[PDB]
Structure formats: C-alpha cells, structure tokens
C-alpha cells in the first residue's frame with residue numbers, strides 16, 4: 001500500500017523506542033501462552049516491537065508487505081534482536097507453521113480499508129495459531145477520533161515531542177465508509193519537515209469480535225491498556241485477544 005514508502009525513512013522518529021514501546025513489549029510477553037511454541041508478528045514494520053520482544057521470547061517471525069520497512073528492520077537487526085523477516089501480505093500469507101502468539105499491533109489492521117480485507121487478515125491470523133495459542137490485535141480506538149472531530153469533517157492538531165524544536169502536526173479527515181485519512185508532518189530540530197499520509201479504517205472491538213468469530217475464535221476480555229485496564233471509549237488504543 002506504500003505506507004513504508006510514506007514513512008519508513010523516519011518511522012522510528014514518529015513512533016520511537018520509548019516507554020510506550022516498552023509497555024507493549026511487556027504486555028505481549030505477559031500474553032504469550034508459551035514462547036517455545038513460537039511468535040509471529042503481522043505487520044512487523046521496522047521491528048519496533050519484534051526486536052525487544054525477541055530478547056525475551058527468542059526468535060520472532062515478522063511479516064510485512066513493505067520492502068522499505070523490512071529493509072529498515074534489517075539494518076537494526078545487524079545490532080540487536082532475533083527476527084526472521086518475511087515479505088508478505090497479511091491478507092494472503094499462509095503457512096504450514098503454527099505459533100503460540102500471533103500479534104498484529106500499532107493499528108496495522110486498520111491500514112486494511114475494507115471490512116472484507118480486515119476479515120480476511122483475521123482469518124489468516126487465526127490459521128497461524130497453534131492449539132492453545134493466542135491472537136492479540138491492537139488498533140486505534142474509534143470513539144475518541146469522532147470526539148476529536150466534534151462534528152467537523154476535517155480537524156488539525158499538533159503534538160510537541162520531547163526534544164525542543166520537534167513535533168508532529170496531523171491533518172485529520174473523516175470519510176465515508178468509516179475511513180480516517182491523516183497527513184502527518186514531522187518538524188525536526190534542524191529546521192526540516194517530513195510529510196507522509198495514511199488511510200485507515202476506524203475499527204471497533206465489536207467489529208473485530210465478529211471477524212474473529214467468523215474465523216472460528218472466541219473473544220477474551222477487551223483492554224484499553226497493556227496493563228489489563230478494561231476497554232473504555234476514551235483510550236487512544238485498544239487490545240483484543242482471541243483463543
């Protein structure tokens with residue numbers, strides 16, 4: 001889809017290796033039923049999660065459709081981690097292997113724009129589960145985005161980043177079909193800007209439960225935070241787990 005062509009060169013500046021990353025690694029590790037049964041990440045990106053997670057669970061298999069994102073992770077793998085890169089599309093990727101933990105996080109599933117494509121990805125993810133394995137999906141929570149828009153099709157916001165002179169401006173657009181378009185502009189301390197855009201589908205725990213039931217899975221308790229906080233409509237992300 002070109003998300004890596006939009007972001008791969010600066011993705012780690014947008015979503016850096018900070019405490020939010022550490023919280024996700026800790027939560028996924030706690031949610032792993034059995035590291036000896038293996039781990040696969042759908043949408044591995046630059047390895048922001050897979051690299052540190054592999055330091056606890058061992059080798060992680062990481063699937064991504066973007067050559068640019070995989071190339072960025074390969075650079076990082078020369079220094080850290082134990083990850084097998086797999087170039088593949090999570091709507092189509094099929095294997096004879098099965099895994100104790102299958103995870104798809106940081107709104108990867110919302111980059112699939114139609115219910116049909118999301119349903120297909122959940123079917124493929126379910127087929128990768130070992131018996132007793134767990135599927136973990138994390139994506140952006142929908143109600144807070146609608147609240148942010150407050151009845152307007154377009155809205156703009158700016159998030160200052162820790163380093164002086166840095167931050168990200170987002171131009172947000174709501175579109176028909178529960179679509180959410182963003183253009184993000186990173187402002188760097190050296191005075192340069194980087195622009196990238198993405199189109200996502202606003203997705204809910206209700207919808208993911210239906211995808212998972214169609215794939216033969218049953219839901220576990222929905223979460224608003226990796227620490228086990230139950231789902232609410234205010235948190236920026238949510239986590240759904242299936243067995």
Ligand SMILES: Nc1ncnc2c1ncn2[C@@H]1O[C@H](CSCC[C@H](N)C(=O)O)[C@@H](O)[C@H]1O
Pocket residue numbers: 001003004015042043044045046047048049063064065066069088089090091105106107108111112
């Ligand atoms: N259909 C698809 N199949 C595989 N990867 C896909 C995909 N659609 C989007 N992606 C990938 O999903 C990733 C979303 S960004 C999240 C990256 C990583 N999981 C992290 O948490 O940091 C990108 O790397 C993008 O290339």
